[PDB]
Amino acid sequence: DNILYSGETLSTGEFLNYGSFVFIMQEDCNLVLYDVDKPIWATNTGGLSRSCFLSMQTDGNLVVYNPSNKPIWASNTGGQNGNYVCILQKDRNVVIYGTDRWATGTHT
Amino acid sequence: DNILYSGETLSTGEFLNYGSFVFIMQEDCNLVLYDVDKPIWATNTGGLSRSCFLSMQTDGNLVVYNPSNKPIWASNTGGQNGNYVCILQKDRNVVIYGTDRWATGTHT
Amino acid sequence: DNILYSGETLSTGEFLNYGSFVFIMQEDCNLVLYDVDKPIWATNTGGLSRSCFLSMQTDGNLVVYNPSNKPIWASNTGGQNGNYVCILQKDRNVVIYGTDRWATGTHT
Amino acid sequence: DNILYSGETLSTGEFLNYGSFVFIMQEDCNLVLYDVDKPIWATNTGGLSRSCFLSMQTDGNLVVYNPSNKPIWASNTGGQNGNYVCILQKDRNVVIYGTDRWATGTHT
Ligand SMILES: OC[C@H]1O[C@H](OC[C@H]2O[C@H](O)[C@@H](O)[C@@H](O[C@H]3O[C@H](CO)[C@@H](O)[C@H](O)[C@@H]3O)[C@@H]2O)[C@@H](O)[C@@H](O)[C@@H]1O
Ligand SMILES: OC[C@H]1O[C@H](OC[C@H]2O[C@H](O)[C@@H](O)[C@@H](O[C@H]3O[C@H](CO)[C@@H](O)[C@H](O)[C@@H]3O)[C@@H]2O)[C@@H](O)[C@@H](O)[C@@H]1O
Ligand SMILES: OC[C@H]1O[C@H](OC[C@H]2O[C@H](O)[C@@H](O)[C@@H](O[C@H]3O[C@H](CO)[C@@H](O)[C@H](O)[C@@H]3O)[C@@H]2O)[C@@H](O)[C@@H](O)[C@@H]1O
Numbered sequence: 001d002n003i004l005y006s007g008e009t010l011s012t013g014e015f016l017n018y019g020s021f022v023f024i025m026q027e028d029c030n031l032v033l034y035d036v037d038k039p040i041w042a043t044n045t046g047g048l049s050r051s052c053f054l055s056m057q058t059d060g061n062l063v064v065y066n067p068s069n070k071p072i073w074a075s076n077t078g079g080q081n082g083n084y085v086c087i088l089q090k091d092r093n094v095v096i097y098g099t100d101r102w103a104t105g106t107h108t
Numbered sequence: 109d110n111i112l113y114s115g116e117t118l119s120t121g122e123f124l125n126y127g128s129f130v131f132i133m134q135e136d137c138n139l140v141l142y143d144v145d146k147p148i149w150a151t152n153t154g155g156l157s158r159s160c161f162l163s164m165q166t167d168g169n170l171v172v173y174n175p176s177n178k179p180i181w182a183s184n185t186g187g188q189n190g191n192y193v194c195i196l197q198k199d200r201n202v203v204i205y206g207t208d209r210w211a212t213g214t215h216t
Numbered sequence: 217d218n219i220l221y222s223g224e225t226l227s228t229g230e231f232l233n234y235g236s237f238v239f240i241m242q243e244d245c246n247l248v249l250y251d252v253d254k255p256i257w258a259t260n261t262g263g264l265s266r267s268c269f270l271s272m273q274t275d276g277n278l279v280v281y282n283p284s285n286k287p288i289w290a291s292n293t294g295g296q297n298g299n300y301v302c303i304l305q306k307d308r309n310v311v312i313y314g315t316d317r318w319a320t321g322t323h324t
Numbered sequence: 325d326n327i328l329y330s331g332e333t334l335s336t337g338e339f340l341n342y343g344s345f346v347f348i349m350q351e352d353c354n355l356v357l358y359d360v361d362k363p364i365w366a367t368n369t370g371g372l373s374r375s376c377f378l379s380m381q382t383d384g385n386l387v388v389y390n391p392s393n394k395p396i397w398a399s400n401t402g403g404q405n406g407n408y409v410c411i412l413q414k415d416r417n418v419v420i421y422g423t424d425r426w427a428t429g430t431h432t
């Protein structure tokens with residue numbers, strides 16, 4: 001999938017993907033955007049811990065947590081509580097949008 | 109694709125899709141969300157014109173336009189100018205989120 | 217997903233999808249190919265049973281089974297035992313190909 | 325897309341993708357299967373030419389050609405003329421299946 005919704009987490013080894021782009025939460029705690037095999041962007045936090053998870057929070061903050069729940073890296077975009085999405089876009093940009101402004105209200 | 113970015117248009121017959129969900133801009137100008145063959149939601153504007161297109165504007169407004177560029181239906185969420193996305197989500201909700209709060213800045 | 221591999225089954229309500237095309241195993245036991253809301257092809261076996269499942273067998277036969285495991289419809293392409301795939305193609309054709317002729321051998 | 329149909333070609337830089345798997349026809353003429361950034365399989369023909377293209381032929385043969393149309397590598401599965409598909413499967417195997425055994429005949 002190419003979208004991480006607020007309230008969701010990407011566990012170790014999990015990722016967002018689109019075409020040849022992979023945004024992965026690595027086991028060495030480095031969050032990396034790859035274009036095939038080339039690292040395009042990273043949090044540069046590899047080695048600081050093991051088995052981190054990525055959380056797209058309801059306050060709009062994207063945070064990498066270690067098992068002890070200490071924040072290793074954050075987008076520092078926390079703020080208003082609502083619904084947000086982190087998207088790995090077709091143009092290779094990873095963007096956080098929010099909050100929701102309109103909906104059809106057809107959610108199950 | 110399941111995302112319509114601001115600055116984009118879905119021409120007549122074009123759509124957003126995810127699994128069995130299809131959000132289509134029909135030729136009879138009705139914008140309909142289908143779950144397989146069942147209409148789940150619609151703007152109920154079929155017959156009011158022919159060959160309409162759907163525009164996700166930079167002001168956050170989702171508008172259905174007829175060829176003469178007159179708005180047939182709108183979400184009425186127009187406002188701040190920026191970047192927005194209209195997503196046909198995995199939970200079957202069609203939602204508009206915006207503006208962008210953070211990005212890796214890796215866009216080509 | 218747009219591929220049903222041999223050894224797999226699509227339970228009631230499950231489907232293959234690609235763009236606006238949905239090949240679904242309905243609860244009324246009718247196997248239907250939809251292009252948005254229009255039925256393009258069907259086995260025309262709706263009502264003959266309830267809760268059927270679709271099986272892409274290892275003998276290359278695509279069979280619709282009722283709960284009592286009696287074949288309601290079949291492609292009648294059963295034959296050589298091997299690996300087959302039933303694909304809902306981008307050109308809107310649903311095709312069974314097989315057997316395998318070559319592989320990288322990189323399966324987990 | 326995760327399927328290369330017979331009669332199609334993947335030009336230089338083009339690829340098949342599924343999840344974190346990328347089967348790419350590189351500009352250095354090496355055909356490589358990547359699992360994120362790790363090479364899982366390759367034809368090991370990098371440097372033998374520039375700007376090769378991958379062809380899934382109607383005779384069931386998968387061939388890497390250089391601009392001068394000389395075969396750099398082949399699966400050597402050429403044979404019966406018909407319809408074939410090369411699939412980058414969900415189980416990380418890249419497999420060629422063919423020929424077609426059955427179809428709904430709903431192709432546009
Ligand atoms: O250009 C962005 C960024 O790229 C490089 O950082 C990304 C790499 O950071 C670390 O070196 C690792 O996390 C590495 O990950 C690979 O190696 C790991 C250790 O062998 C392995 O566990 C992983 O599976 C993966 O293969 C990242 O690829 C670096 O150039 C940065 O300076 C730069 O900002
Ligand atoms: O915020 C007040 C509201 O909170 C609690 O309900 C939360 C749900 O409210 C609605 O049903 C939806 O907004 C639902 O979320 C869906 O729609 C969103 C956009 O409309 C979208 O962003 C989500 O992804 C999802 O599809 C909320 O989850 C509850 O306490 C209510 O009583 C209260 O009024
Ligand atoms: O429950 C939501 C909504 O569903 C129904 O409206 C959707 C239908 O609206 C019109 O009837 C048409 O636009 C129809 O579209 C189909 O028929 C067209 C005309 O034959 C055809 O051109 C299209 O390709 C399509 O097959 C929509 O499906 C209705 O029950 C609403 O009351 C209700 O709000």
Ligand SMILES: OC[C@H]1O[C@H](OC[C@H]2O[C@H](O)[C@@H](O)[C@@H](O[C@H]3O[C@H](CO)[C@@H](O)[C@H](O)[C@@H]3O)[C@@H]2O)[C@@H](O)[C@@H](O)[C@@H]1O
Pocket residue numbers: 089091093095113191192208210211213215
């Ligand atoms: O707004 C001021 C800015 O406007 C003009 O540039 C617009 C581009 O600015 C950045 O490069 C990006 O924001 C780019 O959009 C990409 O990133 C967004 C999030 O960062 C994302 O929502 C988009 O989808 C896209 O990936 C903008 O397009 C120009 O006049 C600048 O000089 C000026 O500073």
Ligand SMILES: OC[C@H]1O[C@H](OC[C@H]2O[C@H](O)[C@@H](O)[C@@H](O[C@H]3O[C@H](CO)[C@@H](O)[C@H](O)[C@@H]3O)[C@@H]2O)[C@@H](O)[C@@H](O)[C@@H]1O
Pocket residue numbers: 145242244246248255256257258260262
């Ligand atoms: O052109 C192909 C084929 O189309 C038509 O058959 C498909 C329909 O067959 C039955 O009528 C039903 O299975 C129907 O399914 C819909 O209705 C069901 C009952 O209301 C419902 O449970 C399903 O969810 C679905 O909405 C199929 O759509 C028919 O014209 C054939 O002659 C023709 O061969």
Ligand SMILES: OC[C@H]1O[C@H](OC[C@H]2O[C@H](O)[C@@H](O)[C@@H](O[C@H]3O[C@H](CO)[C@@H](O)[C@H](O)[C@@H]3O)[C@@H]2O)[C@@H](O)[C@@H](O)[C@@H]1O
Pocket residue numbers: 221299300316318319321323413415417419
């Ligand atoms: O047929 C003889 C063989 O059968 C049993 O092994 C079956 C597996 O054999 C290989 O490992 C693979 O073929 C594997 O299937 C993978 O590759 C196929 C193409 O190579 C592909 O179609 C499949 O989808 C899958 O990716 C088979 O599952 C076993 O009894 C062996 O001892 C015996 O030699």
Ligand SMILES: OC[C@H]1O[C@H](OC[C@H]2O[C@H](O)[C@@H](O)[C@@H](O[C@H]3O[C@H](CO)[C@@H](O)[C@H](O)[C@@H]3O)[C@@H]2O)[C@@H](O)[C@@H](O)[C@@H]1O
Pocket residue numbers: 037350352354356363364365366368370
């Ligand atoms: O385990 C499979 C296979 O892996 C390795 O071969 C794959 C690599 O082969 C060559 O080294 C290159 O084609 C390389 O491609 C990368 O480097 C290129 C040159 O810098 C660059 O142009 C490409 O974009 C790409 O980044 C492949 O990755 C090797 O270990 C084999 O022995 C082994 O069989």
Ligand SMILES: OC[C@H]1O[C@H](OC[C@H]2O[C@H](O)[C@@H](O)[C@@H](O[C@H]3O[C@H](CO)[C@@H](O)[C@H](O)[C@@H]3O)[C@@H]2O)[C@@H](O)[C@@H](O)[C@@H]1O
Pocket residue numbers: 305307309311329407408424426427429431
């Ligand atoms: O082989 C004899 C036949 O060849 C020429 O027609 C080729 C087309 O024939 C059918 O229309 C289809 O098979 C079509 O291919 C579609 O269906 C295939 C399975 O049925 C599938 O594999 C393909 O991907 C495609 O969807 C062929 O392309 C022509 O000379 C005919 O006159 C002649 O009888």
Ligand SMILES: OC[C@H]1O[C@H](OC[C@H]2O[C@H](O)[C@@H](O)[C@@H](O)[C@@H]2O)[C@@H](O)[C@@H](O)[C@@H]1O
Pocket residue numbers: 057059061063071072073074076078
């Ligand atoms: O080290 C990374 C950042 O860690 C902290 O920010 C994370 C926290 O921010 C907000 O308090 C909430 O969103 C919390 O849920 C979240 O954990 C700060 O120290 C920040 O400055 C760091 O950049």
Ligand SMILES: OC[C@H]1O[C@H](OC[C@H]2O[C@H](O)[C@@H](O)[C@@H](O)[C@@H]2O)[C@@H](O)[C@@H](O)[C@@H]1O
Pocket residue numbers: 165167169171179180181182184186
């Ligand atoms: O008939 C549908 C709506 O049409 C108009 O709104 C559309 C316009 O809204 C803003 O002015 C901008 O976003 C424009 O680009 C857009 O066309 C209004 O009449 C509204 O009340 C209607 O609901």
Ligand SMILES: OC[C@H]1O[C@H](OC[C@H]2O[C@H](O)[C@@H](O)[C@@H](O)[C@@H]2O)[C@@H](O)[C@@H](O)[C@@H]1O
Pocket residue numbers: 273275277279287288289290292294
């Ligand atoms: O009624 C549909 C078809 O049912 C039977 O064929 C299904 C069986 O075919 C082969 O025997 C095997 O592949 C079995 O696994 C499969 O169930 C036949 O009666 C056929 O004539 C019908 O068309």
Ligand SMILES: OC[C@H]1O[C@H](OC[C@H]2O[C@H](O)[C@@H](O)[C@@H](O)[C@@H]2O)[C@@H](O)[C@@H](O)[C@@H]1O
Pocket residue numbers: 381383385387395396397398400402
């Ligand atoms: O060097 C790779 C292979 O090249 C040749 O095979 C490719 C040719 O095979 C069949 O003749 C047809 O499918 C042709 O279209 C195709 O180009 C052979 O030399 C083979 O032995 C090599 O392995």
